[PDB]
């Protein structure tokens, strides 16, 4: 039962990390089943999928709904009707965009910056020189609030790759917190269904999970 599941991850889990259910797959009644077990961190991965599914839960007081996946610069109005975070911001055009949004409906999207530290063909990220040298332009967005980074091994990684990966995240974040102390940069927004594990070891504060958690 997913009242079973929950318990087992939390067991495995330090204070330190959250865990976002990944609803993607998944009805509202399996959201109502997973936060009678405790669960308040909703992810999805698609903005459309996530609105659909929204409008009956809005009874619940304090679901904070995640996105995920990848988000296209005309989207960025409804991702920042519905969304409470963010993730992928993986640009700065993006970033501005969503700020610009912020601004004009007078709501304040928590921010991971997605960086690209690995070659990816499938994905999307910033350029980590581009990410340091847009940090000043970052600090004076006045109507997000940017918590920090979200990194996504490129698929078929070896486990090894991907622990030096996790690593190297967790030491470019706190460098990049070093150069900007206007921003909140206390995030690692890594780990998914099968690495988890490891990003919690090299310090991720949010991790993925859907079907360990939810039904099959």
């Given at each position: 039962?997913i009242a079973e599941r929950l318990a087992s991850l939390?067991?495995?889990?330090?204070?330190?990390?959250?865990?976002?259910?990944?609803?993607?797959?998944?009805?509202?009644?399996?959201?109502?089943?997973?936060?009678?077990?405790?669960?308040?961190?909703?992810?999805?991965?698609?903005?459309?999928e996530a609105i659909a599914k929204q409008a009956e839960?809005?009874?619940?007081?304090?679901?904070?709904?995640?996105?995920?996946?990848?988000?296209?610069?005309?989207?960025?109005?409804?991702?920042?009707?519905?969304?409470?975070?963010?993730?992928?911001?993986?640009?700065?055009?993006?970033?501005?965009?969503?700020?610009?949004?912020?601004?004009?409906?007078?709501?304040?999207?928590?921010?991971?910056?997605?960086?690209?530290?690995?070659?990816?063909?499938?994905?999307?990220?910033?350029?980590?020189?581009?990410?340091?040298?847009?940090?000043?332009?970052?600090?004076?967005?006045?109507?997000?609030?940017?918590?920090?980074?979200?990194?996504?091994?490129?698929?078929?990684?070896?486990?090894?790759?991907?622990?030096?990966?996790?690593?190297?995240?967790?030491?470019?974040?706190?460098?990049?917190q070093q150069q900007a102390p206007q921003l909140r940069?206390?995030?690692?927004?890594?780990?998914?269904?099968?690495?988890?594990?490891?990003?919690?070891?090299?310090?991720?504060?949010?991790?993925?999970?859907?079907?360990?958690?939810?039904?099959?």
């Amino acid at each position: 039962q997913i009242a079973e599941r929950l318990a087992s991850l939390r067991s495995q889990l330090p204070p330190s990390v959250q865990l976002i259910a990944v609803s993607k797959n998944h009805p509202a009644a399996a959201i109502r089943e997973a936060y009678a077990a405790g669960q308040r961190h909703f992810g999805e991965n698609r903005v459309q999928e996530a609105i659909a599914k929204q409008a009956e839960l809005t009874d619940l007081p304090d679901l904070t709904w995640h996105l995920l996946g990848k988000l296209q610069s005309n989207k960025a109005r409804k991702a920042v009707e519905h969304f409470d975070w963010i993730h992928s911001v993986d640009s700065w055009a993006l970033a501005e965009r969503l700020d610009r949004i912020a601004g004009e409906l007078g709501r304040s999207p928590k921010l991971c910056l997605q960086v690209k530290l690995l070659p990816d063909p499938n994905k999307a990220g910033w350029d980590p020189a581009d990410l340091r040298a847009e940090l000043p332009q970052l600090s004076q967005l006045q109507q997000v609030q940017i918590r920090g980074l979200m990194v996504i091994a490129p698929l078929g990684l070896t486990a090894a790759e991907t622990q030096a990966l996790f690593a190297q995240a967790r030491t470019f974040a706190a460098e990049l917190q070093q150069q900007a102390p206007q921003l909140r940069l206390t995030e690692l927004s890594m780990g998914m269904s099968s690495d988890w594990p490891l990003a919690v070891a090299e310090g991720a504060t949010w991790i993925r999970v859907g079907t360990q958690l939810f039904g099959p």
